[PDB]
Amino acid sequence: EFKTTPVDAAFVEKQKKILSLFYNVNEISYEAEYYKVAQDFNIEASKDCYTNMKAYENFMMMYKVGFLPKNLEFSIFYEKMREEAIALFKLFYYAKDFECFYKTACYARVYMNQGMFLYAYYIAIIQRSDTASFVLPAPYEAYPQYFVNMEVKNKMDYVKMMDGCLDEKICYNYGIIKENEQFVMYANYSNSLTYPNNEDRIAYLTEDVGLNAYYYYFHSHLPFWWNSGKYGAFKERRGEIYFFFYQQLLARYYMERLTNGLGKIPEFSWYSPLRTGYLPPFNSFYYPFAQRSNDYELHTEKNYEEIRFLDIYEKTFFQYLQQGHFKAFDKKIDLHSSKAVNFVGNYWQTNADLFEEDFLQFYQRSYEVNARRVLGAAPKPFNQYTFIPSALDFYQTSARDPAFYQLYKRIVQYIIEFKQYQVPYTQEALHFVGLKISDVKVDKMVTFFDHFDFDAFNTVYFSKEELKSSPHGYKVRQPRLNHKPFTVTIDIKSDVATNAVVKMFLGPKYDENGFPFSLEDNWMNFYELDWFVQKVNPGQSQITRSSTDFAFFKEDSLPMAEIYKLLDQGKIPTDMFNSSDTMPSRLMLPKGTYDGFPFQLFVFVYPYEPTPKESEPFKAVVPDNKPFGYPFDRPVLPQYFKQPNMFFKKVLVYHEGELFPYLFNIPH
Amino acid sequence: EFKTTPVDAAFVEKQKKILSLFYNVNEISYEAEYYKVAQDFNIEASKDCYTNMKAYENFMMMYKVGFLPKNLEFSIFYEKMREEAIALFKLFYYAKDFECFYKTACYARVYMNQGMFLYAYYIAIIQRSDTASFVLPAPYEAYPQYFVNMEVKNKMDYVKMMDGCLDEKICYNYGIIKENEQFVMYANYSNSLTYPNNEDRIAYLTEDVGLNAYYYYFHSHLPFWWNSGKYGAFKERRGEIYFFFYQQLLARYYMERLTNGLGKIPEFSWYSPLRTGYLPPFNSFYYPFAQRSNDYELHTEKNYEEIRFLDIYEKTFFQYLQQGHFKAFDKKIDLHSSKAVNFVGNYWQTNADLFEEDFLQFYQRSYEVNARRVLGAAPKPFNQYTFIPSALDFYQTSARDPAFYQLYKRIVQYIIEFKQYQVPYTQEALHFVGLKISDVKVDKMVTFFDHFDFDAFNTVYFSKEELKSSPHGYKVRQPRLNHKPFTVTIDIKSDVATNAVVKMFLGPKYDENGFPFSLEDNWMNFYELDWFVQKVNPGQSQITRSSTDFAFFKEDSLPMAEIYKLLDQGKIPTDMFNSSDTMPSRLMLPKGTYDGFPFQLFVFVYPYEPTPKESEPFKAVVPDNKPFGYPFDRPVLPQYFKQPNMFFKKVLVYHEGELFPYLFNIPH
Ligand SMILES: *[C@@H]1O[C@H](CO)[C@@H](O[C@@H]2O[C@H](CO)[C@@H](O[C@@H]3O[C@H](CO[C@H]4O[C@H](CO)[C@@H](O)[C@H](O)[C@@H]4O)[C@@H](O)[C@H](O[C@@H]4O[C@H](CO)[C@@H](O)[C@H](O[C@@H]5O[C@H](CO)[C@@H](O)[C@H](O)[C@@H]5O)[C@@H]4O)[C@@H]3O)[C@H](O)[C@H]2NC(C)=O)[C@H](O)[C@H]1NC(C)=O
């Protein structure tokens, strides 16, 4: 069913050790392995478990003081917590070998705030080169409270308090059933009480567990606060990735907007009311998540300083552009080079690369952090360890808030204003001399919703006795967007046998009006679907390529239950190991219409130039010296896009079955 | 009534060809010369008709694509349109000789957007050194849709459709008359229905056709998007010219306010409502001109982005002022010099010189352009080629909108803030050793209204038959301000004998208070009347100087019909030839009162230093190394303006006959 990889026994021991810190994250089991190891791990007397004496002794300074206590909300966006998280990450990452890393994690798993631990631990598994290939459970299994709406969470809690079902038939009518002595709780996406506006049409994409997790993975693969020295040659292209990642996401999101009749992502002002509100159905130990009403005035007393910070952060960018020959933080940088694109993305992110340092420093203030605090609408932190959460406080929940897409669309618009200074590609740079795409055909592209399970066991609490047996079996089931596999068929005539790159993009055909888009106005609204190297023959030849093979999408994560079962076969899911940071397959297509929703497919073929071997942080970084998003990485002169080796096809996206997800969660 | 210039036969042949492109601008005569020459013109095979190969190929690339279609509105304020107009101007300007220039022009006149052609063609004639001396029809005869209120345009349109007057006597009552088999339509200035406020008191200046032409002329003489290197030594003074032009204009305009009981030009804020609306009676046969209501909020969603831009553009300037010295756009600028005045003007106009380049580039955004888009109130353009027009979209309608003077008042003030850095004139720099003005006498200064005709035939369509005879005779009659000629006599006692510069300025004597203006707060409010050099004798002499001779004012343009008759005699009008970019005489004085309105006449005599031997972009450039507006180019210490070689005279400006122009247009 799913791609597997054979895996050896030494691997199985280690993967098991890793996965085991993810069970009942909210409680300590006094008789699990990890607790004994933690009791036995003398942090004081193990300087020699670490590569780096400075990292170690830094941790100890903080530790002898004290860290964020257990059970409070952790967010990387508050300074003191970040600095604690980073100290923990350093320890994890400079652990001499796996056993030392294991012991430290056990230690932290017992003695530290669980959000803080989980955050550094994910990040550590991904970055340590001895853990590179190891698999993680999906964030929704690790943090189910950020992915379950309140309604469902309370239903789960009440079945635990009752220790099961009064009678099946009552519970069935509340969407609660038993399968194989496991509880299944049916969950709707939220109604207009949480999206009090049109943005509620889109709840099935914005609340999707895959899409939210996607963003979390993205953050974990290269956190803003860390340099990218780990990845060598890639360092010089970090800011490029930032733009590309957000341009792609907004392209995807606009496409969902279009199929639900919704139009452009709205623009705002720090000095004006923001139109579209959001009321999160989440809560922390102390606080329900902050709500932002409709027409929320951004410019109130408590935001005045933050807004002045944000306002000048943007205008500083404008001043660079006005000046052409800019220069922040050491060098003079020219706008027509690419040292430039690097700078641009880093600038908007305030990442560690901007300042050319290893880790972000306590006093270095982020644009994104301050925007997130203003848009999140929360009252100010009570003390440094206690803030009032909003959706924008976490990567697991950010994509739920319409303001998220508005903030990032603004940043993307600014970056695009810079792209006006880049030289557009000429005819000769885009022409594949001697080669011509003569036709493109596609299978029916069809979307539908179907059910989806995950274990939400991590936010139910369990007794001392039950913990001895690491208990799960509280499953949430959700209708989720999906599509049928299709094939793309490309017809090629060339003069000569050569290696080629084939790329595919999906973009809109018509605006909200019903007018055709021009390339000049639409290049930013295409997202990449696939990338691959093909060996062409001389003459007439034919390339077929299934959607299940598209380079940039993954299969669904498996639950840990399945992971252990596969592990017992020496098997592992390829997609969870080789590409967690990639968008889920089921969301590759925006919801269609029974009708057939008009979009367009761009197939581009250009020569393969042999670029040697790396090991970069995302699967978006493909073995090619070309810009990411190439040839749609910058403004376009439309007269150059009628190259024989390019082809635009109208495709229609259909939908099958029920149009509305709630029709799948109705009892009788 | 007008000054003539004898003119030879070669000239008349060339002048005629030139003027013939301005006939029936809006349709094509299949039997006219220009048409046959356009058809015979192989643009492809004639690269050698041009000085610049790059310019040639540049235009060709563009022309293979396609230009603004015929009939649509042309405005140089929209990027793609500007780039196309510039390409076509490059073609005109680099034409090897007059023949190639004519052909290109015929070609353009046939295959291109007429507005775009007229724009480019005007400028080309003014700029090409082999055309430097030739004359042009007044802007109101070439673009009468920009100088005719809608009521009049419709009266003409219906007379054409009717093929003349059904009944002379109905027609008469509507201000339509036959004269020498030509139609004369009487025109009122617009009522409170056009300026829904106090600014309607002034409609007779702001709608005036001379004043609007004047502004069109000033642009065409040196367009912001072009280099000034053609004028050599003048390039170092381009910003100085920019200031002076607006300062003079606003000073003249404020005088009209004072005589109509109106006070200071209101100040505004991008983040607040603008009090004074504008409703233009103009349409583009597609959209009517955009209206701006009273108390229109500038800061609404569609303007968020542009206001951000305008806001930093301003604040960047403040930061200059605060820093005294700084690098900007290559340069290191010190606000204590004059390389400063020039920079400051160039900054505010974002002209080509500010970047040290030949033409404005695609991506260098203009403050004035966005200021005008925001104040103009229009919905956003529909596409590249189709915007909704406002008065601020054209040089020929700009002066009609109250907001125009408010916008330039803002810029001029920012320059005055800079001018506080300039070191004030001292006794020794102003005192003319051994010379004294003992008296100034002035004839009665009297304003009045009288009728003025122009041919509006260009916004009337003709049949195939009529076109064969290039037809005109659709004349508009309008009361326009004017004054009676007068003499200034100056009495001078002097010790020795040199050439002197005599300068005359007009300033207000009191504010809207009734309180005497002091020079400290009035130097910006003087407009120059005259400049001339004089041989001074030892002892006592009298300089007599008539208004009809004032260096900065021109006679009225003759209509083409009259130009043609003069050409038939070997003559052209001097002022249309030697000085089209000068303000008309009739507007020399603001409307007085029967009473007599109190102003002051400033008379300055200083030593003449024989210098520059140049080639003039404007007549405002007189052969003197002194600043423009000297000694009122900068902050004054009032106690140095008491030199014997200065005289301030109180004058009173009278008015005669009807005070309101509408009484000139009443039927029986
Ligand atoms: C109702 O509301 C009130 C007020 O909000 C709230 O009171 C607060 O309770 C918390 C704990 O629940 C209090 O915090 C504790 O305070 C003591 C002593 O605090 C003072 O002394 C410190 C040093 O002497 C000084 O540095 C402080 O600034 C303060 O003045 C602390 O000792 C407590 O223990 C720490 O807690 C952390 C664990 O989460 C650790 O960082 C820390 O280190 C650890 O400790 C062990 C020893 O136990 C050590 O061996 C290890 O090395 C380990 O790292 C230590 O355990 C704790 O901070 C807080 O002060 C109260 N507020 C006020 C204003 O008095 C009530 O609890 C609320 N009630 C209810 C029912 O909700």
Ligand SMILES: *[C@@H]1O[C@H](CO)[C@@H](O[C@@H]2O[C@H](CO)[C@@H](O[C@@H]3O[C@H](CO[C@H]4O[C@H](CO)[C@@H](O)[C@H](O)[C@@H]4O)[C@@H](O)[C@H](O[C@@H]4O[C@H](CO)[C@@H](O)[C@H](O)[C@@H]4O)[C@@H]3O)[C@H](O)[C@H]2NC(C)=O)[C@H](O)[C@H]1NC(C)=O
């Ligand atoms: C430019 O602007 C000016 C000012 O707005 C405008 O002048 C106005 O013109 C109209 C006609 O064109 C004129 O009124 C005509 O007025 C006369 C004069 O009437 C006088 O005497 C009346 C008593 O006998 C008295 O009641 C009036 O108040 C006034 O003092 C009048 O004879 C006409 O009568 C009517 O004729 C029309 C025909 O359409 C019939 O509908 C109606 O039944 C009457 O018989 C007519 O009203 C008006 O007075 C002028 N306004 C001012 C303020 O002086 C110009 O016409 C305009 N010019 C151009 C070329 O655009």
